[PDB]
Amino acid sequence: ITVEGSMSEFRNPVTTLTGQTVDLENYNEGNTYFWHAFWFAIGVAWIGYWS
Amino acid sequence: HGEKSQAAFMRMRTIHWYDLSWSKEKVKINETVEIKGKFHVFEGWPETVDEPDVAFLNVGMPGPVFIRKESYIGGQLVPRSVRLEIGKTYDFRVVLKARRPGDWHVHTMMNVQGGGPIIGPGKWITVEGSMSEFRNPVTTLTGQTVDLENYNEGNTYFWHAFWFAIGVAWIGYWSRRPIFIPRLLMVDAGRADELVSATDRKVAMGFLAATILIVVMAMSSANSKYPITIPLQAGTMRGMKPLELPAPTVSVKVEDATYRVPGRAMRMKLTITNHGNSPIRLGEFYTASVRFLDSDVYKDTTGYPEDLLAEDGLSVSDNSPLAPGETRTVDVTASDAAWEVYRLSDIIYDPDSRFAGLLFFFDATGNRQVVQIDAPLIPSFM
Amino acid sequence: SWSKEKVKINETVEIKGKFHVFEGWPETVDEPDVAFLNVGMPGPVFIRKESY
Amino acid sequence: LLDKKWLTFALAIYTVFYLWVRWYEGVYGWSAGLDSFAPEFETYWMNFLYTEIVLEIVTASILWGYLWKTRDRNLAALTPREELRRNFTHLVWLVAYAWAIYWGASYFTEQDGTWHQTIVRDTDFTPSHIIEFYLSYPIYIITGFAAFIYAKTRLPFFAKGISLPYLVLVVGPFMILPNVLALAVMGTLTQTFYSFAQGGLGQSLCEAVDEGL
Amino acid sequence: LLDKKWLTFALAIYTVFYLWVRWYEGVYGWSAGLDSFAPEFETYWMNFLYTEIVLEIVTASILWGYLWKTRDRNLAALTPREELRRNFTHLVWLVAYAWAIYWGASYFTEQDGTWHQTIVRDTDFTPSHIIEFYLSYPIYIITGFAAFIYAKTRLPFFAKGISLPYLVLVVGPFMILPNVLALAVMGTLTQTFYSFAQGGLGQSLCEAVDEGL
Amino acid sequence: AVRSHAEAVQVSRTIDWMALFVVFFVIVGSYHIHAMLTMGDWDFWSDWKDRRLWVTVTPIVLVTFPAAVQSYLWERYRLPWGATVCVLGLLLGEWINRYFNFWGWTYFPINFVFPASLVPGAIILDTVLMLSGSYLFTAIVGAMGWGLIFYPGNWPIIAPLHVPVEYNGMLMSIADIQGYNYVRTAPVSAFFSAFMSILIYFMWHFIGRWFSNERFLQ
Amino acid sequence: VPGAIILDTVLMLSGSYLFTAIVGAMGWGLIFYPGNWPIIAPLHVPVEYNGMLMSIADIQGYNYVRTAPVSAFFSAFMSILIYFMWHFIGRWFSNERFLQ
Numbered sequence A: 001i002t003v004e005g006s007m008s009e010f011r012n013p014v015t016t017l018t019g020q021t022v023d024l025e026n027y028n029e030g031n032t033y034f035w036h037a038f039w040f041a042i043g044v045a046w047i048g049y050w051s
Numbered sequence B: 001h002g003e004k005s006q007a008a009f010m011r012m013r014t015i016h017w018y019d020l021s022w023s024k025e026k027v028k029i030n031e032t033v034e035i036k037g038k039f040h041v042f043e044g045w046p047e048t049v050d051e052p053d054v055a056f057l058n059v060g061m062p063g064p065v066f067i068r069k070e071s072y073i074g075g076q077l078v079p080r081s082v083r084l085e086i087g088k089t090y091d092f093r094v095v096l097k098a099r100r101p102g103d104w105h106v107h108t109m110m111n112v113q114g115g116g117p118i119i120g121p122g123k124w125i126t127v128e129g130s131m132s133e134f135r136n137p138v139t140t141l142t143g144q145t146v147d148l149e150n151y152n153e154g155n156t157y158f159w160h161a162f163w164f165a166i167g168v169a170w171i172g173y174w175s176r177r178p179i180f181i182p183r184l185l186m187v188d189a190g191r192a193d194e195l196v197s198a199t200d201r202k203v204a205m206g207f208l209a210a211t212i213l214i215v216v217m218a219m220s221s222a223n224s225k226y227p228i229t230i231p232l233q234a235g236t237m238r239g240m241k242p243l244e245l246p247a248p249t250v251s252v253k254v255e256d257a258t259y260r261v262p263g264r265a266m267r268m269k270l271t272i273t274n275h276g277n278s279p280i281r282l283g284e285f286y287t288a289s290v291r292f293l294d295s296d297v298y299k300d301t302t303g304y305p306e307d308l309l310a311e312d313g314l315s316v317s318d319n320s321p322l323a324p325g326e327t328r329t330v331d332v333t334a335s336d337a338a339w340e341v342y343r344l345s346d347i348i349y350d351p352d353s354r355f356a357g358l359l360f361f362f363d364a365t366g367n368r369q370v371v372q373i374d375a376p377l378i379p380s381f382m
Numbered sequence C: 001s002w003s004k005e006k007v008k009i010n011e012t013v014e015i016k017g018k019f020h021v022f023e024g025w026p027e028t029v030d031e032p033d034v035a036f037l038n039v040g041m042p043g044p045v046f047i048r049k050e051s052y
Numbered sequence D, E: 001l002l003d004k005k006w007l008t009f010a011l012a013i014y015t016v017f018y019l020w021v022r023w024y025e026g027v028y029g030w031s032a033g034l035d036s037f038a039p040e041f042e043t044y045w046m047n048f049l050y051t052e053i054v055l056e057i058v059t060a061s062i063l064w065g066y067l068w069k070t071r072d073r074n075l076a077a078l079t080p081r082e083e084l085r086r087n088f089t090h091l092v093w094l095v096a097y098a099w100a101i102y103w104g105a106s107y108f109t110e111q112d113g114t115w116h117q118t119i120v121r122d123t124d125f126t127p128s129h130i131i132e133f134y135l136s137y138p139i140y141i142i143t144g145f146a147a148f149i150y151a152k153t154r155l156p157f158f159a160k161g162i163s164l165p166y167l168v169l170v171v172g173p174f175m176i177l178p179n180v181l182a183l184a185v186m187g188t189l190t191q192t193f194y195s196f197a198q199g200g201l202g203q204s205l206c207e208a209v210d211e212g213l
Numbered sequence F: 001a002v003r004s005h006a007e008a009v010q011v012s013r014t015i016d017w018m019a020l021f022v023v024f025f026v027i028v029g030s031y032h033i034h035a036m037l038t039m040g041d042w043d044f045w046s047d048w049k050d051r052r053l054w055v056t057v058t059p060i061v062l063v064t065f066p067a068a069v070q071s072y073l074w075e076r077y078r079l080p081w082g083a084t085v086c087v088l089g090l091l092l093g094e095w096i097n098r099y100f101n102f103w104g105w106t107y108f109p110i111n112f113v114f115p116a117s118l119v120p121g122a123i124i125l126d127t128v129l130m131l132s133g134s135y136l137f138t139a140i141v142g143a144m145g146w147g148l149i150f151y152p153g154n155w156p157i158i159a160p161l162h163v164p165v166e167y168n169g170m171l172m173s174i175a176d177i178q179g180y181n182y183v184r185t186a187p188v189s190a191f192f193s194a195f196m197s198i199l200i201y202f203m204w205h206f207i208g209r210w211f212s213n214e215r216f217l218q
Numbered sequence G: 001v002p003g004a005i006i007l008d009t010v011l012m013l014s015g016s017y018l019f020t021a022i023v024g025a026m027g028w029g030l031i032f033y034p035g036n037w038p039i040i041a042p043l044h045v046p047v048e049y050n051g052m053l054m055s056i057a058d059i060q061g062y063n064y065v066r067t068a069p070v071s072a073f074f075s076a077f078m079s080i081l082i083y084f085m086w087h088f089i090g091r092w093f094s095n096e097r098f099l100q
């Protein structure tokens, strides 16, 4: 089966029983990233302090 | 006691108990109380509960406040574990003799093999009298009639005391002498072996030979009295007779079913469609030991536990007779504190938001049809 | 049924019958999901030519 | 003088307390302790929990705190006359430990054993669990540590060290948990025995054996 | 003089090579690398295999061969001045090993992990298998050995020996295989550290600590 | 300290008692935890005291402590009651429980929840190790005895529970009926258990070497 | 990270390995889930997807095609024996011998 078009066009919207409608492609992406960076940084901060 | 804390969907979709009856509510010591009923093993048994290939028909109570005199699945007495088959309905009968005075919440429960006691509804029964009145007589194939309350008690005690005494006797013999700090130091600097010597090692083999001797003497003396003995009788009973149910005349279809969080009620939109030939009405939705009834239509007389019976708990958007051949969609609401008290509301913590129950339909002349429903049950918060 | 009682070397004897697996099969014997239709004898005093 | 019935405390203190407990559950095992979702459980049984945890952290802090500070600094030169008195009180601590273990590991343990057979559990916090796990165990652990610390701080031989079998004895419980090794005691006795015999070798203990006894 | 960017080679040599590889599969992952029974697999992917195995046996024989023969025979008397230079080059070998392991054990490994999730395997010889098992692993093992041998043949302390942790570090990978321990590195550093400080104890390293630093 | 070699006798004595108490209850506690934990139990019920499983696991799982404290009390004190003190500990610990809890607390008949009798074995172990002071010897014939004697050792208690009854149309032994009434919620077996106890005695003799260990740390 | 910080710091203050193995591994185990909760939680909002309750996370696995604090306690209690066993495994990998 052949798909024509751009991946940048793709949407995966979903409406929750909670009111909000989100795009599964990117939902919660920034959050995930933040918390990983933050904790990662703190790990570095600790070895950093000793080094 | 013990349901409630267990997962609400397991309770919904595991075994359904109905046509329950209890011969008595108040009972004197040594008296009999008989529990009857039917159970269905749900066709959609969860994952995660080993299929009931080896299940046991138990009783839910605080130990032997009753004793189980008899139990029956189908016609058959069932003192072993039994193989039950998913999809099938059975009738059981438990027969209890009262043993301890008090107020007991007695349940009927199934015990399953791999993970789970499956606890049915509990009813409060009251035993009046003295425990000192209780007798459990039983006649053997060997002539004698004994009381199981005390049979073999003294024997048990004697042999234990006797052997325990000997245990002490042996340590007692060695502890006439000083035990630790001198004996420890003798071993240390220089050799031990002054610490022990016949008459010590005579006593040693005195005990040793006396012990072997008494064991074999006692054994073939125990064989002399009681020459007729069998091994523990065990092993799962197959071939349980299931109940032959007539094919139902109503068929229902569950389109969405929701519950309010938090709340005390479950809504479901059913398409009831009445094949077979008499105007039919909906009288009851049984879900997880909890019974929701439309008193407009049906009234329990069996004295089902008060906390589990929702007298007019069930409301149908339209519960006029449903003519034969006719089919309608109807909004149904099961509603009662029991839904919160028995924590079916806790289905919101379950990894499988799907319910399951029995609907009971009644025609004009009062004869009934049982259809089973299951479906996903979806929360609504806003 | 047994076709023969006395047989020469290289000759054929044929055993037939029915069997019923008991509905009340014990616990303790794994259900016969993988069963093998054998012959009881002291080794290859016969050889199994066929079985059905 | 020598070794007192400060020991009688050690034996009766648990005995009375735990017999009050056995009564206490005895009457509220049935009544409140059956259905956990009833409000009489959150008062007669749950409150009981929060009370004990707090009491245990506190008495553990006070008891260990106490002894570690009254640690004998000038240990280097104190008489064999007291290196015995102390050795004896140490042994009272061990009798308290063993007694405290009896209650925890035998009594309330196999009790919980029976309780399981008689009612299907409504919480991980049954009466017998409130008592077995969160009362009984902390108690014998606290007793355990005390003893250890007393020996480390009060007796030479034990000071400058940390005995292996003793450490193992005392922290061993922290690696015992259920569903769904304490024989170190020996090592630690053979030790406390040697500890008794520094001046107290004499003997007896090698002299008055070669004679009377 | 001292320790050169002969190191920059070591870091970029893998980086470039493996980044070319990641491109190479990147374009032929899809195209040829999907259906193994197509003839474009037996050319772009299978030939790739035979090529690498041969190249690895060869370079391994050359690389180990080289160093074992250029083993410093008169090791007995050579300066602390070079016992440092060499110690440093050795450390470059270890950086090369660690980098090589990164690619093998982390990169291409968890990559193969993703690949399995997205296509059902046609062979034990998928693209990511040709790369993960038979390119990536031999490479870091060859690097491993190189380092080991360099140390044994170039530095006293390591010569007259065969370090345990180091042997274990280097051959360890030979007892790592899948379906259906490399911490030794520590031991071997704590060694290479001592190796650095024979004349280079001084210090710093105990002198210029007791002062500036 | 101390004054006379007669008061020295009095201290070693009032030590003996105190130490015995410690050793005994510390065993009772940890040995019981061991029985418990390694068996959701046969010991609890008359109708679990069977010919295969009970007869087999019980001797095997229980040699352990005896074997370990045997490797200490004899080696370091020539005190040959290592095995029996363990056994007595478990027994007292259980009886106190079975009486005050299994009967007192929740109301199970004693003739139903009595524990298994253990002393004969322990005596065999203690004595076989005492005579011919070789542990290797004890591990082989001693553990042998410990295993074999176990079932016959209980048979006087158990046998009455095995008289046949036709209970409502079904053959059931008394013990069965017991387990059916009071609601809760084949010498190759002996040989096996003996042959097993040997490896277990043996493994635990060395385990006990370690618990005897006298080191200090830092 | 959270866990490893607890491990690292608990061993640093009161430099006893036995201490770390007990409360250190305890922390490492316990902290883990709450440590992931801020990332995870948004993925657990309920959705009625085609008639069936599913969490976002479920829908994700369903869509993108491949081919309960007792749990915490358990894991902490377990980490202890593992930290412990591995403390000694590490003694061996620190080993500095030579051979022949």
Ligand code: CUA
Binding pocket: B001, B002, B060, B105, B106, B107, B122, B123
């Ligand atoms: Cu248990 Cu009502």
Ligand SMILES: [Cu+2]
Binding pocket: B015, B016, B040, B041, B042, B043, B372
């Ligand atoms: Cu059903």
Ligand SMILES: [Cu+2]
Binding pocket: C020, C021, C022, C023
């Ligand atoms: Cu048949």
Ligand SMILES: [Zn+2]
Binding pocket: B025, B303
């Ligand atoms: Zn009434």
Ligand SMILES: [Zn+2]
Binding pocket: D112, D116, D129
């Ligand atoms: Zn428990």
Ligand SMILES: [Zn+2]
Binding pocket: E112, E113, E116, E129
């Ligand atoms: Zn792979």
Ligand SMILES: [Zn+2]
Binding pocket: F005
């Ligand atoms: Zn004198």
